Design a protein around this ligand. Structure first.
Ligand code: HEC
Ligand SMILES: [Mg+2]
Length: 87
């Protein structure tokens, strides 16, 4: 994916709840690689991130209306790379 576009999408749509890769609303369920391993359905993969961004889960809204599939793929790439980089 395009992590540059991904970062822009993240700043506009995700950073309010996930700034610094954390999780405001559900504190343990962060975007850190270890938390993705534990708490994300399907584990630490771009595919699993795309699924959750697209459909939402619990307090996390769905982005399938607001974003295109390309935008979702790009933000997923950014999240995975940032997780691997420890935010
Ligand atoms: C606040 C209203 C949120 C916004 C905006 C976004 N997310 Fe989120 N996210 C939020 C919650 C409450 C949770 C936990 C859901 C649950 O109950 O299991 C999440 C989870 C994620 C995850 C998985 C993290 C983990 O399990 O450790 C990912 C990968 C994720 N969220 C990504 C993400 C992106 C890329 C967003 C912008 C498009 C985004 N979220 C918005 C809360 C909120
Ligand atoms: Mg679609």
């Amino acid at each position: 994916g395009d992590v540059g576009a991904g970062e822009q999408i993240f700043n506009a749509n995700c950073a309010a709840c996930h700034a610094g890769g954390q999780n405001v609303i559900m504190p343990e369920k962060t975007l850190e690689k270890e938390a993705l391993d534990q708490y994300l359905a399907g584990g630490r993969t771009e595919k699993s991130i795309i699924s959750q961004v697209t459909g939402g889960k619990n307090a996390m809204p769905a982005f399938g209306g607001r974003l295109s599939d390309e935008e979702i793929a790009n933000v997923a790439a950014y999240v995975l790379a940032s997780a691997e980089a420890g935010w």
